[PDB]
Amino acid sequence: AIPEEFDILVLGGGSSGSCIAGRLANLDHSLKVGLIEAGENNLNNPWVYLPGIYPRNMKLDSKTASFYTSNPSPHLNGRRAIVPCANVLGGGSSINFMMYTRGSASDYDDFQAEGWKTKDLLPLMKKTETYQRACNNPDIHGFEGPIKVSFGNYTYPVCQDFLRASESQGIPYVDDLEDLVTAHGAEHWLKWINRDTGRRSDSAHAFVHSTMRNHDNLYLICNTKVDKIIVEDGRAAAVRTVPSKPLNPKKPSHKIYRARKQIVLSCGTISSPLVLQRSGFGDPIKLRAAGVKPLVNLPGVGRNFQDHYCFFSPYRIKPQYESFDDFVRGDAEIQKRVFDQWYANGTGPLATNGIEAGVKIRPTPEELSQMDESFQEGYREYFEDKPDKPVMHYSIIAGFFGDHTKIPPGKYMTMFHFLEYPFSRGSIHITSPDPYAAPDFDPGFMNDERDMAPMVWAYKKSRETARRMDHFAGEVTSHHPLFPYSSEARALEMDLETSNAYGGPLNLSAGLAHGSWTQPLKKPTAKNEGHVTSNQVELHPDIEYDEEDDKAIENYIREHTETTWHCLGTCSIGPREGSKIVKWGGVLDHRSNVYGVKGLKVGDLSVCPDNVGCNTYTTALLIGEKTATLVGEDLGYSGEALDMTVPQFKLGTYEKTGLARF
Amino acid sequence: PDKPVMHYSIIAGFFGDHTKIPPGKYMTMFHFLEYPFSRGSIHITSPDPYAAPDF
Ligand SMILES: Cc1cc2nc3c(=O)[nH]c(=O)nc-3n(C[C@H](O)[C@H](O)[C@H](O)COP(=O)(O)OP(=O)(O)OC[C@H]3O[C@@H](n4cnc5c(N)ncnc54)[C@H](O)[C@@H]3O)c2cc1C
Ligand SMILES: [Mg+2]
């Protein structure tokens, strides 16, 4: 039922690869497009389409992730950060936290490609999603794309508090932070959730599984890891593959698919440089170490790796407030209701991503003056020039994203912060011919001195905005930076009466404190009389820092940052000779053709020369449709019907038609 | 020769605030120095019986 020779191969099941695959199959119908993926098929998989069970996908024993491990680095205090990668069809779209956001207009301009300008990509960004939200800026958001975006069907009350708290810190509340022209802001964060159904909006169901029902000319080859891309006579005409799991040691197996006219790498920013390097694309010197024969000289493959630096800081919440923390804990009685409401209706806690509100930031020069002089020096060259770019982002999660086995029982609200444009640059490289062998690579977290100041400053900022929220009960001190014990900057725990409130009536140890493990939090200043009851506020004292209280936050960040999976770079656009933005030299042409070979293209999110200050999923879709359009013109097909609409039953706004709301 | 310098035992549980520790079952070691060298003091600050001494 599967033929050996596809017309257009599309390696990878990544969200970008599903874009290229779905769009490409659609343009001709007659054309035969075969997609190859190293992972399980995900059609109608309950653990994928329903949004609220996202954290499970990240477990270490979890099937759907690869968990690459980095070489140890001094900068992380000897820490060896894991760098997880998606391993299911649809890529990370089947796994992601479903945060929605969009990068600055300056970002796409920074690629400085012959194309790829924001002015050109705006319509293409507009073509790939419908916008369930009550849009005000309708000249930018699409309104009838395959992928749906909304606020979900449930809303934790945390968001209003986070907004009233952020607004008091001099951070403006902007209705749309995805406008592409903003630094400071706050918003009720959008999610990749189909509001009309409550399902996750991954690219696979929207592009691949929606096309296959409708059209015969698409082949899905799940569970076949790519080994190598055979190339001869200057054309990339084949791709030998191996099974994803080597279950038959005595007789290893492989298969060689053929592509008549085009080939495409959408394997993600980690796997892809490896696949090029196994084919011999790289430095001959670096490649002889693995014994692979160097076919083409591309030093830039594997270089210029880039991430974001998230780190979580939980704060305990009052007992009376709602959280998803007890669902993922997870109780057998709460969880039953949480599912039962979703099947019965479609609107429940399960039908929402955890994160509820968030704040992009660009520091005031007055507060910028106290940052380390190195970062000031970086700010002048990098951000001084451009107004559009945020330096750092943080949001708020209505629960604890982490291991609940290792934290005290209760309900928490956890702040999430990720640096927007880390200066640091990593690398990656294969060590062995074997597909299965783990690459050695240096993500290079905190490799550059300049990356620390914004991190510390955002912890100092987010703590203050979590201290002004109505929900706040006290920091969880075990998961906060290790301040000296007598410091006034210290992370205080929950009150005694709240300790009784969580402990239950029958506890024999609530306020009992021996060993001084934690310090009780002081009562809030009394509400003013003579104010309107709705305007009264009771508030904790502001905290202040010294050098010894800064070193602690610094060590905290060094010892607890990790990849945010916004990884990109490696194979990237630029001159073959080299450029300032890509010191080792680029490998792609502006038309996404790999240098030195004919017929090979990259659809990965790796393509980007430099960071996009937004969650990476949107650029995945966008780059996937760029490479799709490029393949389209490369085939010589007319600009008429060059647009490649997927089948879908469009639902209107509920007031336009009666069949579309929750 | 008779005098121990220090003692510790073992408690078949966690003697402390269970609200502030992750859920599970623990065995907690307990150690107390036998003869601390240090010497303290105590003194009343006020005539009132109820007043807390500084010490
Ligand atoms: C846990 C998690 C949470 C995230 N949350 C968010 C979020 O909330 N919002 C957001 O914007 N971004 C988020 N992302 C990041 C975002 O999903 C990724 O940037 C995006 O999916 C990148 O897509 P890609 O096409 O570049 O790579 P991928 O989606 O990883 O595509 C790569 C595919 O190729 C396959 N593959 C790899 N090697 C081979 C090989 N040798 N042969 C065959 N197949 C291979 C992989 O199995 C995978 O399916 C998150 C990511 C993680 C993983
Ligand atoms: Mg990834």
Can you tag this structure with a few keywords?
part of a larger assembly; 2 chains; 662 residues; alpha+beta; 7-stranded mixed β-sheet; 15 helices; 21 strands; globular; binds flavin-adenine dinucleotide; Alcohol oxidase 1 (chain B)
Structural domain count of chain A: 2
Helix content of chain A: 10-25%
How many individual β-strands of chain A? Answer: 21
The ligands bound in this entry are: flavin-adenine dinucleotide, magnesium ion
> Mind telling me the C-alpha Rg of chain A?
25 Å
Mind summarizing the main beta sheet of chain A? 7 strands, mixed
Instruction: Characterize the quaternary organization of these chains.
Output: part of a larger assembly
Count of runs of 4 or more consecutive helical residues of chain A: 15
Shape of chain A: globular
Counting helices, strands and paired strands, the structural category of chain A is alpha+beta
Keywords (chain A): FAD, Flavoprotein, Methanol utilization, Oxidoreductase, Peroxisome
Subcellular location (chain A): Peroxisome matrix
Pfam families (chain A): GMC_oxred_C (PF05199), GMC_oxred_N (PF00732)
Cofactor (chain A): FAD
What is the secondary structure topology, with strand pairs?
The structure is cut from a larger assembly and holds 2 copies of chain A.
Chain A: E1 5-11, H1 15-28, E2 33-36, H2 46-49, E3 68-69, E4 82-83, H3 105-110, H4 118-126, E5 129-131, E6 147-149, H5 158-167, E7 187-188, H6 203-214, E8 218-221, E9 224-226, E10 238-243, E11 255-265, H7 268-278, H8 284-288, E12 303-305, E13 309-317, H9 334-344, E14 355-361, H10 365-368, H11 373-382, E15 392-397, E16 412-419, E17 426-429, E18 440-442, H12 452-466, E19 472-475, H13 496-503, H14 547-560, E20 562-563, E21 600-602, H15 617-634
Parallel strand pairs in A: 1-2, 1-11, 2-8, 5-6, 11-21
Antiparallel strand pairs in A: 3-4, 7-14, 9-10, 10-11, 12-17, 13-16, 13-19, 13-20, 14-15, 15-16, 17-18
The structure holds flavin-adenine dinucleotide and magnesium ion.
Flavin-adenine dinucleotide binds next to helix 1, strand 9, helix 7 and helix 15 of chain A.
